[PDB]
Design an enzyme around this catalytic site. Sequence first.
Site, short mmCIF file in Angstrom:
data_model
loop_
_atom_site.label_atom_id
_atom_site.label_comp_id
_atom_site.label_asym_id
_atom_site.label_seq_id
_atom_site.Cartn_x
_atom_site.Cartn_y
_atom_site.Cartn_z
CD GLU A 82 14.64 22.25 8.91
OE1 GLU A 82 14.42 21.05 8.79
OE2 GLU A 82 13.69 23.30 9.00
CG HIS A 112 12.85 17.85 9.16
ND1 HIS A 112 13.07 18.87 8.40
CD2 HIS A 112 12.21 16.83 8.64
CE1 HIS A 112 12.23 18.72 7.28
NE2 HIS A 112 11.89 17.38 7.40
CE1 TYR A 168 1.95 15.89 9.02
CE2 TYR A 168 1.33 13.69 7.80
CZ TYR A 168 2.41 14.75 8.42
OH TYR A 168 3.90 14.51 7.99
CD1 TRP A 193 12.33 13.41 18.33
CD2 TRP A 193 14.04 12.10 18.16
NE1 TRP A 193 11.96 12.76 17.41
CE2 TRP A 193 13.02 11.67 17.05
CE3 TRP A 193 14.93 11.19 18.25
CZ2 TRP A 193 13.24 10.72 16.19
CZ3 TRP A 193 15.18 10.45 17.26
CH2 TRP A 193 14.30 9.91 16.13
CB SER A 212 9.50 17.37 5.06
OG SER A 212 10.76 16.94 4.96
N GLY A 247 9.98 12.22 2.63
CA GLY A 247 11.12 11.81 1.72
C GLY A 247 10.73 11.55 0.13
P1 LIG Z 1 10.76 15.28 4.96
O1 LIG Z 1 10.31 14.55 4.01
N1 LIG Z 1 9.81 14.72 6.43
C1 LIG Z 1 10.30 14.09 7.33
C2 LIG Z 1 11.78 13.41 7.31
N2 LIG Z 1 9.45 13.99 8.42
C3 LIG Z 1 9.87 13.11 9.39
C4 LIG Z 1 10.52 13.95 10.58
C5 LIG Z 1 8.04 14.59 8.59
C6 LIG Z 1 7.05 13.88 7.67
O2 LIG Z 1 12.45 15.03 4.82
C7 LIG Z 1 12.92 14.35 3.67
C8 LIG Z 1 13.18 15.61 2.97
#
Ligand SMILES: *[P@](=O)(/N=C(\C)N(CC)CC)OCC
Lengths: 529, 532
Positions: free
Chosen positions: A326, A439, A130, A431, A200, A119
Amino acid sequence: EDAELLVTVRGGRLRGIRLKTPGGPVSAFLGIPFAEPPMGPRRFLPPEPKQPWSGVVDATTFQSVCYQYVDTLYPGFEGTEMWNPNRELSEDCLYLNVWTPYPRPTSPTPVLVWIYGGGFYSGASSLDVYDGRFLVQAERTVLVSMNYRVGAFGFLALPGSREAPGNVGLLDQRLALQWVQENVAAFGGDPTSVTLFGESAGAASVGMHLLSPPSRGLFHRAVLQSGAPNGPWATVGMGEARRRATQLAHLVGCPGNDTELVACLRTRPAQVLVNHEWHVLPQESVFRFSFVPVVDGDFLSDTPEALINAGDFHGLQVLVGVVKDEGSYFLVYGAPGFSKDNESLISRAEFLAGVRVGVPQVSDLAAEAVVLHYTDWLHPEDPARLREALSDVVGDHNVVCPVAQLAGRLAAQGARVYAYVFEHRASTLSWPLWMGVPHGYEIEFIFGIPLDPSRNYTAEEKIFAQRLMRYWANFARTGDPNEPPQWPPYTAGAQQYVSLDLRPLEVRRGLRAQACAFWNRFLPKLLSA
Amino acid sequence: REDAELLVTVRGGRLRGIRLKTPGGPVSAFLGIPFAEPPMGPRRFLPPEPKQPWSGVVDATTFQSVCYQYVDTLYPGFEGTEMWNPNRELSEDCLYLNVWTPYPRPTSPTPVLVWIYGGGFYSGASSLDVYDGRFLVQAERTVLVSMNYRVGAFGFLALPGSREAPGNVGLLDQRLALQWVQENVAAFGGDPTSVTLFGESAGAASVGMHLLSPPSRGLFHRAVLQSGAPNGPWATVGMGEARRRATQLAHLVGCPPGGNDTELVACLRTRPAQVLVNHEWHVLPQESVFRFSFVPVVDGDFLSDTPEALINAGDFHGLQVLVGVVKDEGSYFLVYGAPGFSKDNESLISRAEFLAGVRVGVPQVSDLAAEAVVLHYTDWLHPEDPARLREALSDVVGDHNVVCPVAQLAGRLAAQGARVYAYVFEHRASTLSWPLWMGVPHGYEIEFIFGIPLDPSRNYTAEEKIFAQRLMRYWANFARTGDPNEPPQWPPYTAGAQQYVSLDLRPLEVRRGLRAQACAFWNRFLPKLLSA
Ligand SMILES: *[P@](=O)(/N=C(\C)N(CC)CC)OCC
Ligand SMILES: *[C@@H]1O[C@H](CO[C@@H]2O[C@@H](C)[C@@H](O)[C@@H](O)[C@@H]2O)[C@@H](O[C@@H]2O[C@H](CO)[C@@H](O)[C@H](O)[C@H]2NC(C)=O)[C@H](O)[C@H]1NC(C)=O
Ligand SMILES: *[C@@H]1O[C@H](CO[C@@H]2O[C@@H](C)[C@@H](O)[C@@H](O)[C@@H]2O)[C@@H](O[C@@H]2O[C@H](CO)[C@@H](O)[C@H](O)[C@H]2NC(C)=O)[C@H](O)[C@H]1NC(C)=O
Ligand SMILES: *[C@@H]1O[C@H](CO[C@@H]2O[C@@H](C)[C@@H](O)[C@@H](O)[C@@H]2O)[C@@H](O[C@@H]2O[C@H](CO)[C@@H](O)[C@H](O)[C@H]2NC(C)=O)[C@H](O)[C@H]1NC(C)=O
Ligand SMILES: CCO[P@@H](=O)/N=C(\C)N(CC)CC
């Protein structure tokens, strides 16, 4: 003393480490500094190239995680802790990592460059999910990943000011890409075959490098997993960025010169900025983040959506896709009635309340349009249908339909696009079952984590992971994931994609075409009048 | 001499009827009973005045003239259109009604069915072959009444507030006939305490307006609305737009040579009736289908508010209503102006023709509203398939004008105390002359409700004769008891379950939702969009 683990780059000498995999050894160079530490006066400033060093830099372990919020929604829960920092926090965090086959390749090998998500407020290249050792061993590629500044440290913007221009976290990524161009050959990598991939906000980052000419010369192919630069969360306007930066200063006791404002912010401990980060958002919401890339005419000369519509993308190959559900992950972070520990069978009133949280900062009329489209008017109050519908609302608005719009526009404007939907729920998923395939949970399969013997993936899963690694590496090498059942390109008309699960490839039509016509075609016209 | 069964005394004087033959036996018919003074000359545009008493015996032995109206010429000689055209001479002297009663006259009070024809408030007549009441009366033993009412400018030209042309006089024609039934139907054996209104299209919209007007509500007890609702976007007009259309019609025929309303109407009254008809369609604000120049006006008198408002705010306890639609409400109207449509080819339209058809089928809405329609009715996996586009535009026109207004009326009445029964008519008549792509078009359930397949001179199949007798039984069961079921069941319609039955050659099949997803757009969202 092992010559395979000794490398000279332009800044000086490095010592790496030999890592074990089930398929054999891997050379790893972890924690390579590519920028000067953005500390003190350098906070909020664009990255500066790392100055040369004497002696040998120890590149045998991951370096610090960039300062970021630490999730506390479910303390100790694997599903959330796997995304939290696994190294100490520091503003001295601009390091990258190189995995290469052992012994180091003698001839140029295609390069994969990973940009993590989170995010734009979190993330780290050191997370277990990773780990690049399996991709490199299985598919004979060089893999690079970098840390980039997140939160206020990477994306606080007072537009027009030199002290806080914004988008410096994106410039961290670009500098690492420039580092790859200048130095990856020393590890055996081919700088003329660099494939960006991210998930993401990392996928949104990849798309923004696609749309920024200074970055376009630093790579050749792109993979966007569950993210797009045209997502409603991925960019912010100049005025709103200034409001959020100014509100943060007020919240931390800082004062009107932009210069005075940034100088006061620079005296505050990094953790103090983190503690007030979420309080600058204008509304109670999910899937919205305080400090994100800003559209100010420099890194992005226009909005990503305008740049997508007006671009000539002939000669570009992209691999894009989404997971099956998602929206589900984000619902437990603020949608009324949702929790990982119950069935989240919400009422109609909770559904209507969730719509305002999941689609923030839109008029009442826009919200009513959402309710009209996502209500089954033969079952308007069925809790199970309402739970699934709100997940669709959040997932379509923020991920699926932005990805579908990018795919369709690029394909119609000269790019070769391959699209997927990831539909396998890992046997190890912590989960609840109602969240489906949430996601971020295709990543472990792309990186071949199921091949780790100390994990509990099934035999079928391991084969599945090896299939996905081959697709991704085939695309990196040739721009085509297919093995020479075929994976056809995505087009604006046929809208063909494949499902990725334990079964063989199945070709289908439409990335939620009916729903995404609403978000991508109608709602913009409604909001403008 | 005289057949005492064919002699009846009503309040105005004595009548002489005729004995009609039916396959099931004789029926007494009194056709062309005057219920109002002829609205000619100075009486044009004025509310009807009751027919003054007469001496001697009035011969009520044949249908009277059709009220002056436009005559359709789209497909000259074609049965599908000619069946709706006048079958009697045109005249402003047209305020007559008809009574069918069993032979011999009923001994005890018999339930009454009162038919109101459709025709977009610009056309129609109680004398059409498809409205022949002899079969319903013989088969189900009811008294059937039908009336002529003024249409077009003569019935619905409105200069609101004006004494000379108040508007809605065609509705007052219907009400006067209803008052006539209350005062006189017992002389024919009918029960004035059991009167069921039923009508189709604009006749159904008329029925709904009597439901929503208190002076009419005391004149009947049950209602049937076939393929029409008073809340249809075509069924009413505002005071200002009614005045604009009336003023434009006067201007087109040389009146004044706007201004004073008294002078304006006086000039209009000097024009030949055919001259007004010849200019009727030129006053519409936009090129469209399913829009009509002179319709009921919402002026606070007959309708104290819009029908939608009156429906949403009404208490309907003690009321039973039967509503329904045909399977393909939109198809008929597409050949009257939608680009690329014709009864003589497959009407496989292009995407551009579909987008153009939306503006014609949904006239007088903003571009944003039109974009919302296109979003909804486009299959974005097959956005340019001609067959799907043809079906989609038919759905657009049918949902907007018929299905969704009926569904909203059904849902609100049921939720506010009424007992509602809903149907979808899904049988395509073996004798239908329209092309196959039009499906079951608007208006083609009527012949089965009236039992026309029982006519020996027609070529309906034996199944269709059985089918017609089933539907006549449903309608008469509802007229007698407020319940079409027999003393497979037909469940009531409710706002939640939204249950209706399919009417075809197969037994009753219960289904859910009168195009619920589509009608949520028309009934719930689109009003919010238009206000912002
Ligand atoms: P993305 O940045 N990624 C998220 C929330 N993630 C945790 C499951 C993977 C690093 O979502 C916000 C756009
Ligand atoms: C499903 O859970 C949510 C979340 O509630 C939390 O988690 C539960 C496991 C339980 O421990 C709760 O006490 C926790 O608060 C429930 O939503 C909450 O409901 C309470 C009322 O009991 C309300 O005060 C909170 O504001 C709600 N929180 C949110 C985020 O909506 C929900 O009711 C549960 N569903 C059930 C029990 O059917
Ligand atoms: C609108 O005009 C009417 C009618 O005016 C009559 O007709 C004209 C041809 C001309 O001959 C006038 O002289 C006539 O008076 C008006 O209604 C008349 O009003 C007068 C005075 O109050 C009355 O004596 C008449 O009986 C009325 N005639 C009717 C009702 O037919 C009316 O006042 C005018 N309104 C305006 C000008 O606002
Ligand atoms: C389907 O028919 C319409 C209507 O055209 C009329 O009816 C046809 C059966 C044929 O007899 C035509 O000659 C008639 O004019 C066609 O649309 C018309 O096309 C003509 C020129 O091709 C044009 O001048 C008219 O304006 C059109 N009318 C409308 C209402 O659009 C349509 O093209 C036919 N579709 C076919 C043949 O596939
Ligand atoms: C509102 C327009 O539709 P309705 O008045 N009735 C129609 C068109 N017909 C002809 C099929 C029956 C008389």
